Structure formats: structure tokens, C-alpha cells
Design a protein around this ligand. Structure first.
Ligand SMILES: Nc1ncnc2c1ncn2[C@@H]1O[C@@H]2COP(=O)(O)O[C@H]2[C@H]1O
Ligand SMILES: Nc1ncnc2c1ncn2[C@@H]1O[C@@H]2COP(=O)(O)O[C@H]2[C@H]1O
Lengths: 219, 224
């Protein structure tokens, strides 16, 4: 949007930290990570929140909890509740990010208290989503969870093509079973069954979802 | 009048106020019987509650009418805030498991408080960051921990929140049926009763109504 003075501002605008836009351009210092870079590891002191400008970061534990992309914030939980990193954050593509420490965020919030309401909103949403993932681990079979994960990654990283619907997740198969919490083998067969069925085509780092309806039904 | 102070004490413990002072924010009371659905998953919601006394289970029903419980709320815990901060349907039901006294507030009341007192926002973020961490642990326990490990863990979490000292032992007054405990742990009732009987047979706990008396917390902690 040539409405914002920077792509940075557009994505930060989409992250929620604003709510304009010559004023927005009072913004922070970027950082570029290579692919495969562990931005921080689980259990480390956490003094820093990041917001992704471009690229994807996986969040993992010991299970992958989520794949984040442009405008997604990570590293906030140890800023809001001081203590060790709850998970590792590793880049699965090259990533440009902006970051800020607890002092900087507090001055950001003092300056615009409204930002706190947007941060609560994002947290509440993460809670909602995580609740659903847990309820899936309890109430849904493996291929049902595979189907859920494909349609989740779609809603965030999906591009209409035809359509439908290309989802370029940038994940290996290991990485997709880790999102679903099942064996690579159990997830391998669910994806082959869906591909056989005609509902998806499977092309390395992206799935062409041709039949979103029946995928959704399989949940 | 001693009850008022009581109430002030319990409510001053609420996570939302841990950065306030007083605190006479505080003066909308509501009383509920046991087994009252305060609200139902998917219902429209514009109101949060802080418990003064009693307990409330947070639950989701599956398609096949099965349920799990996400958490149990007690004195000074806040529920119903997620549809205030992210406007839309209740993400779960809130059902009272004993008689409950609470006070509540709507989206607009809370937003005045925040504008007035931003230290409230920071505490609300802390409580939510904490619920998220806990929920990640729960979700991971479901993938990687065995049932008796989850049972022991669950007894000790409940002890942190609802534990009282009786001499050298910790009384955990959970107020839950065996079915509710199993739903909280996310395993069958029989698998969960067996874990509980083992622990009891070994002298670590005593099952005494809707309470556990934890007579050897060191041993129970080592079991998870
Ligand atoms: N359930 C979740 N959903 C999305 N992101 C998460 C979840 N749990 C943890 N994270 C992210 O992982 C980060 C790890 O570092 P922090 O604990 O500082 O902050 C955490 C969040 O940004
Ligand atoms: N994982 C969780 N941990 C603690 N409390 C929760 C969790 N999920 C839902 N809740 C509470 O349950 C409430 C249901 O209604 P709301 O979604 O408005 O607000 C919700 C939270 O207060």
C-alpha cells in the first residue's frame, strides 16, 4: 500500500502496533536473519520481542506450536511475563524482522496506551487458537488434524491460483507431522490419501488445495 | 462487614489489580448456584467475571458430546475476558461447580479502567501470557506425558492454587467429581481412578471427598 511510507510500516501496521501514516513513520532498527537461524532458544533469557517483516519463523519446543509469517510478533511472552523463553524461534526462510526490548515497548505503550489493547487482542487470539489445537489433539484423529493444519496454513499463507488454492508453507514433511503432533508415517499416509482422493496436489514446499470443502469436512 | 473485608481481600488478589493500590474500582455482584452455566461456548459475550468464592470449570464440548476441561477457576481468578479483548463468541463454557459469588464487568467498564489506569493492561497481559504458557504445557503433556504423570501434575497444579496446610500435609480442595478430574487430565475415568488409587495405596495422597490430602508432595512431585 503506497498509502504507507514503507513496506515496513505497512506490515507493522498490519501487526497492530498502530491505529497514521506519516505519524506511523516514527518507526526502530531492523535485522536480517539467514534461513535456519535460531533467533533464540527455549530456556534462554528473553529481553526482546520481534515482529516479522518478511519470511517465516517456526516456533518449537521439544512439537512445532505454530508457523509465523509477515506481521506476526514473537518473543512477547517473556516480555509480558519476565522469565525464560517458552519456545525456540527458528527461521524456515530468510527473514527480515524488527525488534524491541522491554524498555522500548514500555515507552511505546506510555506514548500510546492504545497499543496495549492490540497486544491483549493478539494474545487472546493465540489463546483461542492454541485451545483449538489442544481440543484437536483430544477430539480429532490424525488425518483430521492433518486436514486442519493444511487449512490453517492456507488461511494465513494461501494464495488464490485458479483457484483454489496454493499454500506455500515452506515446511518439510517432518515439520508438518510436528505441527500435527503425529508420526511422520501417520501424517505421510494422510497426505497421500488426500492426494490420491484428488483434494490436494503435493509439490514440495507448497500444497495446491483443490478441494477445501472436503478437506474441511474430513475434520 | 467482616465479609466485605473478605471480599476486598479476595478481589485485591485478582491479577487485574496487582499493579493498582486501592482499588475502590471495585464497587456489580452476582450469585450463582452449583451447576449453573454462566455462559455457553459460542454464545455472544461482553462480560468478564472475577470469582469471590466458589469454583467454575471451563469446558469445551466435542461434536460427539464429549468434553474436556481447560481449567478450573477459584477465588480471585478472572474468566470471560477473551471475548472482551478479541470481540466475538465465548471460546468455551463457564459452569459453576459449587455455589459461586462473583462480580462482573462489561467491555465498556473495563476500557475506562484501562484508559484511567494503564498498569491494569500490563497485568492483564501478564495473566494472559501465563495462561498461554500453561496451555502450551497442557497441550505438550497430552502429546508426551503418560496419564499418571498428568494426574500427579494436575494434583500439584491444583495444590498451587487451592492448597491449604494441615500440619505436615497439603489439603487440595478441588471440588471436582472423578469424571471432572479425568476431563481435566484428558484421559479415561478408569485410567485416572487407577493412577489415583496407586498414589493413595502408596501413601502419597488420600482421596477424601472432593479433596486430596497430599501427604508426600516430594514423592508425588517426582512422579510428575
Ligand atoms: N501457542 C502459541 N501460539 C503462537 N505463538 C506462541 C505460542 N506459544 C509460544 N509462542 C511464541 O513463542 C515465543 C517463544 O518466546 P517467548 O516465550 O518470549 O514468546 C513466545 C511466543 O511469541
Ligand atoms: N487455556 C485457558 N486457560 C485459562 N482460561 C481459559 C483458557 N481458555 C479459555 N479460558 C477462559 O474461558 C473463558 C471463556 O469465555 P471467554 O472466551 O470470553 O474467556 C475465556 C477465558 O477466560
Amino acid at each position: 500500500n503506497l498509502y504507507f511510507q514503507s513496506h515496513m510500516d505497512e506490515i507493522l501496521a498490519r501487526a497492530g502496533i498502530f491505529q497514521e501514516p506519516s505519524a506511523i513513520a516514527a518507526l526502530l532498527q531492523p535485522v536480517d536473519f539467514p534461513r535456519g537461524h535460531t533467533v533464540f532458544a527455549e530456556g534462554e533469557p528473553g529481553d526482546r520481542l520481534y515482529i516479522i517483516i518478511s519470511g517465516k519463523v517456526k516456533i518449537g519446543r521439544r512439537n512445532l506450536l505454530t508457523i509465523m509469517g509477515p506481521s506476526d510478533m514473537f518473543g512477547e511472552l517473556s516480555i509480558f511475563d519476565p522469565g525464560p523463553r517458552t519456545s525456540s524461534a527458528t527461521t524456515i526462510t530468510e527473514v527480515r524482522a524488527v525488534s524491541m526490548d522491554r524498555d522500548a515497548l514500555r515507552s511505546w505503550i506510555a506514548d500510546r496506551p492504545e497499543i496495549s489493547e492490540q497486544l491483549l487482542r493478539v494474545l487472546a487470539r493465540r489463546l483461542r487458537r492454541t485451545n483449538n489445537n489442544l481440543a484437536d489433539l483430544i477430539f480429532t484423529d490424525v488425518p483430521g488434524r492433518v486436514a486442519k493444519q493444511l487449512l490453517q496454513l492456507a488461511q494465513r499463507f494461501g494464495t488464490q491460483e485458479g483457484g483454489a488454492l496454493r499454500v506455500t508453507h515452506d515446511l518439510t514433511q517432518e515439520e508438518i507431522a510436528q505441527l500435527v503432533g503425529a508420526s511422520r508415517e501417520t501424517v505421510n499416509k494422510a497426505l497421500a490419501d488426500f492426494a490420491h482422493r484428488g483434494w490436494i496436489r503435493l509439490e514440495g514446499k507448497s500444497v495446491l488445495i483443490s478441494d477445501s470443502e472436503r478437506l474441511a469436512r474430513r475434520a
